[PDB]
Amino acid sequence: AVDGFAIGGGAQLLLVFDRVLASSDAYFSLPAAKEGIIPGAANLRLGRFAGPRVSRQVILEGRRIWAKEPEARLLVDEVVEPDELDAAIERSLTRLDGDAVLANRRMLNLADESPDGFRAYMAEFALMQALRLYGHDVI
Amino acid sequence: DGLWAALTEAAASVEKLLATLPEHGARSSAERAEIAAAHDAARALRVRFLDTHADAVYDRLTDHRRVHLRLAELVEAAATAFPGLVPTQQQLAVERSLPQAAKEGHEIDQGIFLRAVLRSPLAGPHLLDAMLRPTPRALELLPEFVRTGEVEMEAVHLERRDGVARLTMCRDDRLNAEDGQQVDDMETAVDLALLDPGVRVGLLRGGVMSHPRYRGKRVFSAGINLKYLSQGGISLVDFLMRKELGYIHKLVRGVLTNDDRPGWWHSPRIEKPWVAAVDGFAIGGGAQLLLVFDRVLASSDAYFSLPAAKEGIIPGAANLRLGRFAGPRVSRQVILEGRRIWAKEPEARLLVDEVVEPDELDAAIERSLTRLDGDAVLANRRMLNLADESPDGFRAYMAEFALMQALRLYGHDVI
Amino acid sequence: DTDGLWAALTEAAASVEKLLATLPEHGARSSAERAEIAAAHDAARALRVRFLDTHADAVYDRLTDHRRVHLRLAELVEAAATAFPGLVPTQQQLAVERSLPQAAKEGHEIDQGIFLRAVLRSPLAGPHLLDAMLRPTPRALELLPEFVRTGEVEMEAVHLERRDGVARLTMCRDDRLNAEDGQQVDDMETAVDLALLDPGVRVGLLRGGVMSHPRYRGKRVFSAGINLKYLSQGGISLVDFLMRKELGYIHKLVRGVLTNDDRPGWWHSPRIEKPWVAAVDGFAIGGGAQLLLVFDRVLASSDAYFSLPAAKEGIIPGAANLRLGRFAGPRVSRQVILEGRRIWAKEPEARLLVDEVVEPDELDAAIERSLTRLDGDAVLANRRMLNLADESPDGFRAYMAEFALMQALRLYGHDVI
Amino acid sequence: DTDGLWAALTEAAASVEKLLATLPEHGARSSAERAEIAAAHDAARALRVRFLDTHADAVYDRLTDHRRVHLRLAELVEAAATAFPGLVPTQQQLAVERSLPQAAKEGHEIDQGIFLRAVLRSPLAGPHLLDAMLRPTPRALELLPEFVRTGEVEMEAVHLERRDGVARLTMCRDDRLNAEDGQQVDDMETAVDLALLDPGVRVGLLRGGVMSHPRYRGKRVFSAGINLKYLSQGGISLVDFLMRKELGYIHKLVRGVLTNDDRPGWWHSPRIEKPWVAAVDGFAIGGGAQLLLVFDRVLASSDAYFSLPAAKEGIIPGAANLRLGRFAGPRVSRQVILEGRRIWAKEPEARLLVDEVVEPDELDAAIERSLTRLDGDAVLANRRMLNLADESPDGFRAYMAEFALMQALRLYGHDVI
Ligand SMILES: CC(C)(COP(=O)(O)OP(=O)(O)OC[C@H]1O[C@@H](n2cnc3c(N)ncnc32)[C@H](O)[C@@H]1OP(=O)(O)O)[C@@H](O)C(=O)NCCC(=O)NCCNC(=O)Cc1cc(O)cc(O)c1
Numbered sequence A: 001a002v003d004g005f006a007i008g009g010g011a012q013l014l015l016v017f018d019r020v021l022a023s024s025d026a027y028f029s030l031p032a033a034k035e036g037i038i039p040g041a042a043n044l045r046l047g048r049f050a051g052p053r054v055s056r057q058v059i060l061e062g063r064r065i066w067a068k069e070p071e072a073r074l075l076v077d078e079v080v081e082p083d084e085l086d087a088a089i090e091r092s093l094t095r096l097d098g099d100a101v102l103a104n105r106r107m108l109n110l111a112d113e114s115p116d117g118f119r120a121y122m123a124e125f126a127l128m129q130a131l132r133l134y135g136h137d138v139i
Numbered sequence B: 001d002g003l004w005a006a007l008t009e010a011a012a013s014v015e016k017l018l019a020t021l022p023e024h025g026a027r028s029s030a031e032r033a034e035i036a037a038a039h040d041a042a043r044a045l046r047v048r049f050l051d052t053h054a055d056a057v058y059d060r061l062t063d064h065r066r067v068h069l070r071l072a073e074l075v076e077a078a079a080t081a082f083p084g085l086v087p088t089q090q091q092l093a094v095e096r097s098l099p100q101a102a103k104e105g106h107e108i109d110q111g112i113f114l115r116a117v118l119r120s121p122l123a124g125p126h127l128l129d130a131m132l133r134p135t136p137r138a139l140e141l142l143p144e145f146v147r148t149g150e151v152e153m154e155a156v157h158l159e160r161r162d163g164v165a166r167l168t169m170c171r172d173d174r175l176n177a178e179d180g181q182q183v184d185d186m187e188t189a190v191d192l193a194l195l196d197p198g199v200r201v202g203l204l205r206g207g208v209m210s211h212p213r214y215r216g217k218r219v220f221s222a223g224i225n226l227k228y229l230s231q232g233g234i235s236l237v238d239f240l241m242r243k244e245l246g247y248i249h250k251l252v253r254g255v256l257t258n259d260d261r262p263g264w265w266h267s268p269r270i271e272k273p274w275v276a277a278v279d280g281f282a283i284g285g286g287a288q289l290l291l292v293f294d295r296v297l298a299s300s301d302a303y304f305s306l307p308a309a310k311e312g313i314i315p316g317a318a319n320l321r322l323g324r325f326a327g328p329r330v331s332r333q334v335i336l337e338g339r340r341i342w343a344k345e346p347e348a349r350l351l352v353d354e355v356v357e358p359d360e361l362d363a364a365i366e367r368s369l370t371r372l373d374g375d376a377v378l379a380n381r382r383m384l385n386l387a388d389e390s391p392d393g394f395r396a397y398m399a400e401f402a403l404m405q406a407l408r409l410y411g412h413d414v415i
Numbered sequence C, D: 001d002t003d004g005l006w007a008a009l010t011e012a013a014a015s016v017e018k019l020l021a022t023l024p025e026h027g028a029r030s031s032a033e034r035a036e037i038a039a040a041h042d043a044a045r046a047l048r049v050r051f052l053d054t055h056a057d058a059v060y061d062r063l064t065d066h067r068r069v070h071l072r073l074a075e076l077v078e079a080a081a082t083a084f085p086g087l088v089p090t091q092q093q094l095a096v097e098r099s100l101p102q103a104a105k106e107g108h109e110i111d112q113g114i115f116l117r118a119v120l121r122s123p124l125a126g127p128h129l130l131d132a133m134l135r136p137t138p139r140a141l142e143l144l145p146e147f148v149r150t151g152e153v154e155m156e157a158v159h160l161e162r163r164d165g166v167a168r169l170t171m172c173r174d175d176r177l178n179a180e181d182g183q184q185v186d187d188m189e190t191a192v193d194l195a196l197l198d199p200g201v202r203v204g205l206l207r208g209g210v211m212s213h214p215r216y217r218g219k220r221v222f223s224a225g226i227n228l229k230y231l232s233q234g235g236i237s238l239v240d241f242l243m244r245k246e247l248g249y250i251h252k253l254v255r256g257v258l259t260n261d262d263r264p265g266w267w268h269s270p271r272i273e274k275p276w277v278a279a280v281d282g283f284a285i286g287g288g289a290q291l292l293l294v295f296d297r298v299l300a301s302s303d304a305y306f307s308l309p310a311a312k313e314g315i316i317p318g319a320a321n322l323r324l325g326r327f328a329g330p331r332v333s334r335q336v337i338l339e340g341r342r343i344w345a346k347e348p349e350a351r352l353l354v355d356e357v358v359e360p361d362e363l364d365a366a367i368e369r370s371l372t373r374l375d376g377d378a379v380l381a382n383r384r385m386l387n388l389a390d391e392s393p394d395g396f397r398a399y400m401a402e403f404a405l406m407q408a409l410r411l412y413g414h415d416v417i
C-alpha cells in the first residue's frame, strides 16, 4: 500500500508484489537519472510492467508517474482517496487467501521473470553497480 | 395593496419579542417556536411587497436608476428609507458580535431584498453595472500604483512587471483562507490591474506559505475561512455577494468606467485576459475562480474541489459555471457528492489547461503570459464570454443565489 | 371579436366539419376526395395558428379566469374544446379518433398541438400551465395518507416503497419490459408525487424490477422504451402521455412538486424537491434513457446500454433533444438521436450519462451507498441552483412549445405507423 | 428626432468631412493632424451609437416600411446611406475606401458595424433582418428551374450536383486551396439555396474538390482559410462577406430557407431545412472549420487537421466563438481560438468536432454510407429540435449583433494588418 510516495527502492519493490494500492495523492519515481546509481532490479522489471518506452522515460530521463494519471495503472492496482485507503486495503487482503492463489501466483512468476533471467541480470549488476558506486558524479 | 404597513406590523411584532425574550440559547420551545413563526410571517411579507414594488423601491434609492450604488451602499440606503425591509447598520452590528450560531438571521432579509432587485429587467442590470465600476480604494491608489508598480495589501500583493499585473495571494498564515477583507484587497487588485494602462495581462497565483505544514511552498487557496463562518464573520452582502458581483465578475467583463477616454462607445468596459496558476491546491472559492480565467496552469501535484457537499454552503457561482466546463454529470459528482479532480487525472483537463512539474511551473507560467498579448485576444476573449455566460444567465442565477445562500448561511448543519 | 380570425377559423373547420360529414370514412377516400379534406384541414389548422398567435393569452385567460385557476393538460384542452368549438377536438371527437386505426385519422390531435404550443410560447400562460403541472395530482394527494402509514403502495406500472428514508420506485411491468402508456405515466407521476410529499422520503430511487417474459427471465431491465404496440394500433396520446410525461413527473424530478401556501417557509421554497437516483439493469431504451438526463446520481450495470432507437422512422424522444446536448455534445447527440447510435456502460463515452458502472453482482451495494450520500439540506440547495444553470425555466418552456406541435406532427406523419 | 442626437451626429460628420477635405492625404498627415482626424471619427462614431440606441427601430421601420419589406444586408445598409447621410457610408465612399490599403482607410465600415449592431440588438428589427437573410436569393431563385432540370450547376467557386437525392456541393478552388473570398461566398449561398429548394434533394453534402496547386496536386482539400491577400488589399467586405456569410448561407445550414406562404404546411414549417454532411480532406483552417460547427455529420480523413489560426494577430474567427465552446468546452475553445491550438484528426479530442475518422483509402466509401442515414423524417424532426436547444434564436442574434461592431473594429485594428 502506498501513502504519500514511492521514490527509489520504494518504487522498485512495487514491481514484485501481488497487489499494489496507493492513495490518489501519490506518485512514483527512480529519478536517479543524470547522476545517481542503478535503481536495483528495476531495469529488469519495469520493462514488463510499462514497455521499453516508458521504462526509459522513468529510469533514463527521470520521469515520475502520478498515482492518478492513466499510466499509473501500469504500476498500481487500485487508487483511492487516503480517507478510504484503509478499507480498500483490508478488503484487499481477504481476496488473496485461498491456496488457488498460491498456485496461480507461482506460475505467473515462473512466466514473468525466470531463473536464468534474474541470474543473468544480477550478475552484471554485481559489477556494473560496484563501478557506479565509486563514480565521480554519484559521489 | 396596503402591503407596506402590513409588512411593518410584521417587523413590529418581531421587534417586540426582540427584547421581551431572553438571550438566544436559553429560550424554550414555545419561546423559540414563537420568534421563529414571527420571522416567517415577516420575511414572507418582505417578499410579497418586493415582488410588486422592487423597481419602485429601487428607483427611490437610486433616483430612478440614475445613481450607481454598490451592494453595501444600496442595502444601507434601503434600511434607512424603508425600516423593516432590511437590517440597519447597527442591527447587523448586534448580529456580527454574536457567533453565527446564535444570530437571528437578519441577513436573510438582505437576501430577500437583493434577490427581488436582481430579478427585475431594470434594477438588476443596474445593481450589476454598479458593481463593475471601479472601487474607490482602487481609484485612490491608482496614480500611486502607476508610478510605483507595486501595491502591498493585507491579503493580496499586486505588482506590474513586463506588462503583467501579477497578483499574489499571500496569507502567510492560513493558506490564503478567504475572508471579507481579502475580498477587498482582491477587488482592488483587479481594478488597479485593469485601469493601469501599463498592464496587458493579469496573473493570479499563491505566495509562499509560512505555516509549518507548508513552509517554503506556495498554496493557491483553501476556500473560505471555516472559522469566521461559525464565528459570524462571513457577510452575506459584504463578502458572499460582493465577491460574485465584485471582482469575480470583473475578471469576466472588466471595469465599467466613466465616459472619459476615446473608445468608450465600443468598449464601455475595460477587460483584459487573466491567467491563473495553481500550486498545491484549489479548494472552494479557490476552485470557483478557475472557472473564469482565460488560462489555467497547475503543478501536477495539485487537485481541486468544493467539497462542501453534505453540510456546507453553496460554492458561489460554481453551480452556474462548472456545468459548461464538465457536463451535468461531473458537475454534480463535484458539487453534490463532494468529489475532487486530481491535477493529473484525465478529467483535470476539463478545468485546467496545462499541468507540469512544480520545478518547471514558473516557465510554463511565463511562456504563458506572453501568449495572450495582442488586441486580437481582447476581442476573441470578449465574444467567447458573450457566448459562454450571458447577462440574463448570470443575473437570474445571482438573483436566486442572493436568497438561497442567505438561508444556507443560517442553517443548522452548516453552522 | 373584431379581429375576424375567429370566424374564418369557425368556418374553415365548419367546412371540414361538413366535408368529413359527407365523404365516407378513410380509404374510401375518393380520392382526392382527400386532397380536399387535406386542404380543408391545412386551411383550418393554418387558421388555428393565426388566431392563437394573437389571442392565446385571451383564450387562456378565459379558460382559467385570468391565470387564477391551475388546470392540468387534460382539463385545459377539454375546457378549450367546449368554450371554443373548432379550436381543439372535443372529448367526443377525440373519442371517435382514439378508437380508429391510427394510420387513418383526420389528425385532430394536431389541433391540440397548435394549442399547447401557442399557450406555452406566451410568457404569460407559459409559466402558469407549467406551474399547474408542477402541482401534485389528486390520485396521490388522495393516496398520501395511506402511504405515510404503510410505506407501501402497489400500483399497476410502478411499485412504491419507503425504506430508510428512501422512496424506492420500481417500474414493475415484467410482461413487457416496462413498456409505456398512460397508465404507466399515471403511476409514475403519482409515485413521484407521493415521494416528494412523504415527509419521510429524503431521497428518491428508480430501478426496474425483475421481468417475467421468457426472453429476460430472472433478471430485471430498466425500461424497453415506449410501447410500440399501442403506437401502431393507434394511441400513444399526445396529451395524456407525451406532453403529460414531460410537463408532469419528468419535470417534477427536476423542480419538485408545487404546494399550496401552507407550510412555513413557502415564500422561499414553494416546491418540495429532493434528489433522485436511477440504477440501470439490462438496458435503458427510448423513454427510459430519456429519464437518465434528469437524475442527480446514476448507476448502470457494466453489461447494459443506452439508446434512443427511432432514428430513421420513429418520432422525437421527448426532451432528449434539449438535454442530451448539455450531456455529451452536439456530435454525440446527433449520433445517438439522428443516427441511432448505442452506448455500452463500460465504454469511455458512457461516463457522459452514467456516474457509476458496476458489475451486476455489486450493483445492490453501490446503489445503497449512493442513497446515503444525497442526504443534506445543502444538497437540496445546490441541486436547485444547478438545475437553474442547466435548464432555465425559459429554455424548457420554449422547447416544449415547439415539441407539442412537432411531436403532434410526427405523431401522425404518415411514415410513423 | 427631438432629442437631436441626429444633429449632433450630422454636426459631427461635418467636422470629419471638413478635416479630411482640408488635411493632407493619410500618410502625409502629421502626428497632430492624425490625432485630430482620429478625434473627429471617435466623436462621430460615438454619436452614431447614441442615436441608434434610441432610434434604431425607427430608422429600421423607415427603411423597411415598418418591418413590411425584407431587405438583405447590402440593400439595408445602402438604403440606410441615402436615407440617413452620415449614419453609414454611401456606395461611393465604400468605393473610395476600397481604392486604398487597409491602413489609409478612414475605416468607414465601422459605421456599418455600428448600424448592423444596433438593428440586431433590437427584438423587433433583429429577427426581421435575419428572416430576410434566410429568404432564397435572386440568383438561386433564377437558377432553381435549370437546376431542377439538368441536376448540375457550375459556379466559379462551388459545383452543385444532384445525385440520389444528394445535393453534392464541391468547393473547387484548386488554384487557392479554397480560400474564402467575396465570390466564393456568393456561390456558396446560391449553392445552398439550390440544394434547399430542389425537392429532388433530401440530404446535402459539402466537400472540397481536388486541388491543382503544385504543392497539393492530386489531393482533395476542404478549406484553407479566408483569402488573405484581400485582407491586406481590401477585398474583405464587413458586409458582403463577413456578415453575409454568417447571416446567410451558414445560417441556412441550420434553419434552412424561409419561403413564402406557398406550399402546404407552411403554417408549421415556414422554412425548408435539410441535413448536411461535410467531409474533410487534408485540412480545415479558418472559416472552413467554422462550417463544421453547423453540419449534421462530420467525416474526416486520418491525416486531416483543424484550426482557427486567426489567434495572435487577426480577426474574430466567425461565429466560432459562439459555437466552439458548445463542442469542446470553454478550455478547448480558447486554446483553439485564443492560443491557436490545432486539433489533429487522429487524436482523442477530434471526436468533439468530427464524427468519423478513416484512412483516405476508404473515406470515399464512408462518406457515402452516411449520406444514406439522414434520409429520414424524424431526422428532420430530431434535427430541427436539436438545433433549437443547441442555439437559441435570441442567443445567435445577440452574438451576431456584437460581432458586427467588434469585427468591424478588427478589420481596421492596427495589428490585423
Ligand atoms: C486544506 C486542508 C485540507 C489542509 O490540510 P493540512 O495539510 O492538514 O493543513 P492544516 O493543518 O489543516 O492547515 C494548515 C493551516 O491553515 C489553516 N487553514 C487551512 N484551511 C483553512 C481555512 N479554510 N480557513 C482558515 N484557516 C485554514 C489551518 O487552520 C492551519 O493553521 P492551524 O489551524 O493553526 O494549524 C485543511 O486546511 C482543510 O480541510 N481546510 C478545509 C478547506 C475547506 O473546506 N474550505 C471550505 C471552502 N468552502 C468555501 O470556500 C465556501 C465558499 C467560499 C467562497 O469564497 C464563496 C462562496 O460562495 C462559498
Ligand SMILES: CC(C)(COP(=O)(O)OP(=O)(O)OC[C@H]1O[C@@H](n2cnc3c(N)ncnc32)[C@H](O)[C@@H]1OP(=O)(O)O)[C@@H](O)C(=O)NCCC(=O)NCCNC(=O)Cc1cc(O)cc(O)c1
Pocket (backbone or CB within 6 Å): C175, C176, C177, C179, C180, C213, C215, C216, C224, C225, C226, C227, C228, C229, C242, C245, C285, C286, C287, C288, C309, C310, C314, C315, C316, C317, C318, C319
Ligand atoms: C428491448 C428489445 C430490444 C428486447 O429484445 P428481446 O430480448 O429480443 O425481447 P423481445 O422478444 O423482443 O421482447 C420481450 C417481450 O417484451 C415485449 N416488448 C419489448 N419491447 C416492447 C415495447 N416497446 N412495447 C411493447 N412490448 C415490448 C415484447 O413484445 C416481448 O413480449 P412478446 O411480444 O409477447 O414476445 C425489444 O423488445 C425492442 O426492440 N423494443 C423496441 C424498444 C423501442 O424501440 N422502444 C421505442 C422507444 N421509443 C420511445 O420510448 C418514444 C417516446 C417514449 C416516451 O416515453 C416519451 C416520448 O416523448 C417518446
Ligand SMILES: CC(C)(COP(=O)(O)OP(=O)(O)OC[C@H]1O[C@@H](n2cnc3c(N)ncnc32)[C@H](O)[C@@H]1OP(=O)(O)O)[C@@H](O)C(=O)NCCC(=O)NCCNC(=O)Cc1cc(O)cc(O)c1
Pocket (backbone or CB within 6 Å): D175, D176, D177, D179, D180, D213, D215, D224, D225, D226, D227, D228, D229, D242, D245, D285, D286, D287, D288, D309, D310, D315, D316, D317, D318, D319
Ligand atoms: C493553408 C496554408 C497553411 C498552406 O501552406 P502551404 O502548403 O504552405 O501552401 P501555400 O504555398 O502557402 O499556399 C498555396 C496557395 O494557396 C494560396 N492561399 C493559401 N491560403 C490562402 C488564403 N488564406 N488566402 C488566399 N490565398 C491563400 C497561397 O497564396 C498559395 O498561392 P500563392 O500565394 O500564389 O503561392 C497557408 O496557405 C496558410 O497559412 N494560409 C493562412 C490560412 C489563414 O490563416 N486563414 C486565416 C483565416 N482567418 C479567417 O478565416 C477569419 C474569418 C473568416 C471568415 O470566413 C469569417 C470570419 O468571421 C472570420
